[PDB]
Amino acid sequence: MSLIDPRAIIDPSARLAADVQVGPWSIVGAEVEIGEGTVIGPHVVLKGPTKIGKHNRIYQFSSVGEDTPYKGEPTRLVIGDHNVIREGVTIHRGTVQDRAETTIGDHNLIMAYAHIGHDSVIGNHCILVNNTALAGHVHVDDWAILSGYTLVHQYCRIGAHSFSGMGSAIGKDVPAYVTVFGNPAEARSMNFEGMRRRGFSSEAIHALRRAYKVVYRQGHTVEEALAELAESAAQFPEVAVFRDSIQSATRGITR
Amino acid sequence: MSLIDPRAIIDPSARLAADVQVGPWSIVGAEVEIGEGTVIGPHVVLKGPTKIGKHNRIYQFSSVGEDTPEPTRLVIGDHNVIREGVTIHRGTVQDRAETTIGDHNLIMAYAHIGHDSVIGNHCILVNNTALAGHVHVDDWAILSGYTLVHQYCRIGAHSFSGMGSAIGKDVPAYVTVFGNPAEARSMNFEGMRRRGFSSEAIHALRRAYKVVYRQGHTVEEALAELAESAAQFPEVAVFRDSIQSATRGITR
Amino acid sequence: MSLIDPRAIIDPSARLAADVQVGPWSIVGAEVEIGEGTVIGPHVVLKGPTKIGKHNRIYQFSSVGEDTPDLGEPTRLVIGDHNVIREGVTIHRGTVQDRAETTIGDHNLIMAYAHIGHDSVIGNHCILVNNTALAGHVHVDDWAILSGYTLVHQYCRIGAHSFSGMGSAIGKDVPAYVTVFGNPAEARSMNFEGMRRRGFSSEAIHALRRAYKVVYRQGHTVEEALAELAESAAQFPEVAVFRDSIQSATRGITR
Numbered sequence: 001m002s003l004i005d006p007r008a009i010i011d012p013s014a015r016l017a018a019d020v021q022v023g024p025w026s027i028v029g030a031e032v033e034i035g036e037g038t039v040i041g042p043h044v045v046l047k048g049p050t051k052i053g054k055h056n057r058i059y060q061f062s063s064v065g066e067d068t069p070y071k072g073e074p075t076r077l078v079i080g081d082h083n084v085i086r087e088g089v090t091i092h093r094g095t096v097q098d099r100a101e102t103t104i105g106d107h108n109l110i111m112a113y114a115h116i117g118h119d120s121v122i123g124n125h126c127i128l129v130n131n132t133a134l135a136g137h138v139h140v141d142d143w144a145i146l147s148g149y150t151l152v153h154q155y156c157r158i159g160a161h162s163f164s165g166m167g168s169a170i171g172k173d174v175p176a177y178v179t180v181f182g183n184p185a186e187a188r189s190m191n192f193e194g195m196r197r198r199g200f201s202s203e204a205i206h207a208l209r210r211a212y213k214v215v216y217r218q219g220h221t222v223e224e225a226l227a228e229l230a231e232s233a234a235q236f237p238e239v240a241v242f243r244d245s246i247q248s249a250t251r252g253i254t255r
Numbered sequence: 256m257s258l259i260d261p262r263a264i265i266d267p268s269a270r271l272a273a274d275v276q277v278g279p280w281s282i283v284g285a286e287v288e289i290g291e292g293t294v295i296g297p298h299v300v301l302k303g304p305t306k307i308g309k310h311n312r313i314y315q316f317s318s319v320g321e322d323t324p325e326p327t328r329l330v331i332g333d334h335n336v337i338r339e340g341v342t343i344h345r346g347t348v349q350d351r352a353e354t355t356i357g358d359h360n361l362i363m364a365y366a367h368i369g370h371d372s373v374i375g376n377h378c379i380l381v382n383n384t385a386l387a388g389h390v391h392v393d394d395w396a397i398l399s400g401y402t403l404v405h406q407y408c409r410i411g412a413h414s415f416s417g418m419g420s421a422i423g424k425d426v427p428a429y430v431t432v433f434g435n436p437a438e439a440r441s442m443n444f445e446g447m448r449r450r451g452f453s454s455e456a457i458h459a460l461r462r463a464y465k466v467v468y469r470q471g472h473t474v475e476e477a478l479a480e481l482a483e484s485a486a487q488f489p490e491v492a493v494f495r496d497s498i499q500s501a502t503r504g505i506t507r
Numbered sequence: 508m509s510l511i512d513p514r515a516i517i518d519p520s521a522r523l524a525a526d527v528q529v530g531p532w533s534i535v536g537a538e539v540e541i542g543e544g545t546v547i548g549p550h551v552v553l554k555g556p557t558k559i560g561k562h563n564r565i566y567q568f569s570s571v572g573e574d575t576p577d578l579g580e581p582t583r584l585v586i587g588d589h590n591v592i593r594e595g596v597t598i599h600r601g602t603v604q605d606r607a608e609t610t611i612g613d614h615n616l617i618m619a620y621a622h623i624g625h626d627s628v629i630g631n632h633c634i635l636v637n638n639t640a641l642a643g644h645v646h647v648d649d650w651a652i653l654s655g656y657t658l659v660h661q662y663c664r665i666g667a668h669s670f671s672g673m674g675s676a677i678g679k680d681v682p683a684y685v686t687v688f689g690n691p692a693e694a695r696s697m698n699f700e701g702m703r704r705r706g707f708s709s710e711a712i713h714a715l716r717r718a719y720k721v722v723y724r725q726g727h728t729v730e731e732a733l734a735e736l737a738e739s740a741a742q743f744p745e746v747a748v749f750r751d752s753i754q755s756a757t758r759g760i761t762r
């Protein structure tokens with residue numbers, strides 16, 4: 001049996017690496033580029049201009065590279081390497097001219113029926129659990145986990161190693177390591193489980209626990225908090241990752 | 256390349272207008288009528304008795320015209336966009352509760368339109384919005400992502416629900432609702448300005464909101480107080496009529 | 508015509524009863540077993556080791572028998588008789604080694620886009636309404652009704668004849684007959700409506716109303732409540748079902 005199933009439709013403008021697998025009844029549309037070792041399942045719709053990197057797995061009933069719901073404006077979707085895109089996932093392209101294309105990095109897991117809205121940016125090692133929805137212009141940093149049915153408002157930033165509880169509705173920025181829950185989302189604590197899994201030192205975990213309290217439990221303003229964290233951020237690069245996510249928040253921080 | 260892809264299944268009783276496009280591996284079932292300029296994507300399941308109007312677009316993995324889990328019908332108007340994975344059930348004809356969708360609607364990815372529901376014109380049902388059944392959505396309503404609507408609920412003209420809202424009661428026209436359970440917050444003044452409502456009409460609607468929600472009046476007292484402004488501004492009469500026709504009470 | 512559509516793919520290791528119907532563009536994977544009177548719709552993906560019983564109906568765009576997006580461990584899915592699996596439903600296999608296969612009994616209705624996580628167990632006469640998600644290791648007892656978009660945390664037990672309202676987020680065990688609402692889920696009352704439809708005696712309904720008060724409205728600890736329910740449970744099999752569900756609660760009960 002051929003690597004490209006004879007029941008699949010490959011557009012003559014699509015560029016594929018030699019070992020790409022494409023399952024039956026799948027469409028690889030115009031201007032779709034697919035890298036080495038990628039596996040396209042059956043019943044998949046791929047639309048371009050889209051770049052899919054190496055060693056990716058895209059499951060049935062997914063629509064990857066769709067137009068968002070002027071004529072001829074260049075729009076693009078870039079997906080890196082070692083990603084898993086499960087059944088029914090929808091991923092929209094993003095505008096090129098303004099450097100706001102839809103981008104997905106490496107080693108991500110995008111679970112069933114998740115939605116990635118136009119101009120969203122997903123880093124590396126993220127997990128978007130079933131039916132997570134990024135409205136659009138969402139920035140998800142490395143190792144973030146969004147539990148099932150997490151809804152993210154347009155323009156929100158989800159910090160590195162952050163966590164959302166199931167059914168959370170995020171309206172403001174989530175700082176690095178922070179855990180959020182409910183509709184509307186509220187900050188609860190820090191992802192100490194994720195910190196341990198990543199092999200963080202005891203001094204680094206303690207400095208981060210102290211950092212959370214400075215921001216959320218000591219009644220200080222964002223301006224007051226950032227000034228107090230300066231000393232701790234200089235000694236630990238992980239407290240600096242927390243400090244930078246607060247400093248770069250536009251919609252305010254999830255409290 | 257033919258308009259009707261040779262890999263699609265078209266039942267002999269289906270009636271398609273000459274320029275209708277059907278993508279590969281789509282099923283156009285028996286008693287399905289499709290009007291001029293409509294585009295059916297690939298992997299679409301269309302079941303009848305269903306009448307689809309002119310210049311519609313139906314995306315992949317949609318199931319339109321499903322039986323509810325006696326002649327039943329589904330009627331879809333003109334210029335609608337039905338995105339990927341949307342599910343639309345038919346409604347009962349004898350009791351005049353067929354499922355109806357008007358014109359210029361945008362029904363986004365994985366939205367669900369339960370049996371006997373009625374959607375007006377220019378409505379937006381964002382991703383995963385779910386109408387349980389017998390839901391009436393009036394013109395220009397916006398239901399944000401993952402809005403859930405209890406059976407028999409009425410969604411007023413130009414109303415708005417925030418993301419993840421769970422609506423159990425009627426939403427009056429223009430009203431903005433948020434959360435689970437849904438709570439009224441304000442009016443959609445932004446929408447009024449886009450529609451070209453006058454400053455005077457907006458002013459009267461803002462006063463009408465206060466009468467219903469911020470002055471401790473009963474529904475009976477509020478309706479009597481709005482009578483004067485409703486005769487003067489047709490937009491206020493839209494707001495008053497939606498409260499008058501509320502069978503499950505109003506969202507507060 | 509032909510019971511198996513010529514456009515369907517039937518793996519040579521699949522075992523089917525002679526009258527099994529399979530629609531166009533459906534995949535019946537390796538190690539899939541399908542019983543008498545079952546109808547598989549078009550665009551269905553079935554993956555094994557999976558057993559599907561008699562007189563079942565599986566709708567378009569469903570992925571039944573897939574492996575979880577995180578694990579040579581042999582895993583299985585077993586589905587009983589007279590079930591209806593609506594469009595876009597995802598059902599994952601379990602694990603055999605620790606006796607946690609994913610199992611679904613008889614006369615169940617699994618509505619559009621519902622998710623059945625790995626190692627979950629569904630009894631009989633249950634209804635999972637549109638987009639209900641069982642994260643994994645979830646036990647759903649007989650006649651439970653989970654309203655649209657109900658989210659169920661891993662390891663939660665849903666009691667017999669219980670009911671969740673639309674958009675409920677369940678993080679603790681739901682006792683038998685209990686009605687729960689919101690995110691986080693909160694106990695409200697009992698499903699008396701369901702009892703009456705099931706033909707429960709007025710005496711059994713009266714005893715269950717009293718049982719709810721003992722657990723939830725009289726300031727008793729779970730130890731105290733279980734001691735007070737002992738007498739009623741010995742007399743009413745329906746009260747024993749309620750008592751057993753509180754006894755077997757590992758995550759505490761939904762209050």
Ligand SMILES: Cc1nnc(CN(Cc2ccc(C#N)cc2)C(=O)CSc2ccccc2Cl)o1
Pocket residue numbers: 109127129130145146147148149166576577622624640641642643658659660661
């Ligand atoms: C299974 C399981 N393992 N951990 C959890 C908790 N979790 C976060 C999480 C989930 C998966 C990975 C992984 N790889 C990591 C973290 C949730 O999102 C629960 S909700 C949910 C879960 C699954 C489907 C639908 C829903 Cl709604 O679930």
Ligand SMILES: Cc1nnc(CN(Cc2ccc(C#N)cc2)C(=O)CSc2ccccc2Cl)o1
Pocket residue numbers: 069115117133134135136151152153154361379381382397398399400401418
């Ligand atoms: C994109 C975008 N543009 N506006 C918004 C806000 N919006 C209303 C809205 C959304 C789209 C149109 C349109 N055509 C109009 C209004 C939401 O529904 C947010 S939630 C959400 C949003 C998108 C996907 C999934 C989810 Cl869950 O999102």
Ligand SMILES: Cc1nnc(CN(Cc2ccc(C#N)cc2)C(=O)CSc2ccccc2Cl)o1
Pocket residue numbers: 324367369385386387388403404405406616634636637652653654655656673
């Ligand atoms: C229709 C209808 N008939 N009863 C209800 C109430 N119901 C429970 C329920 C639903 C169906 C059966 C059945 N067979 C039994 C109980 C809900 O879940 C409402 S929410 C919902 C409902 C439908 C789609 C999306 C959503 Cl979100 O809806």
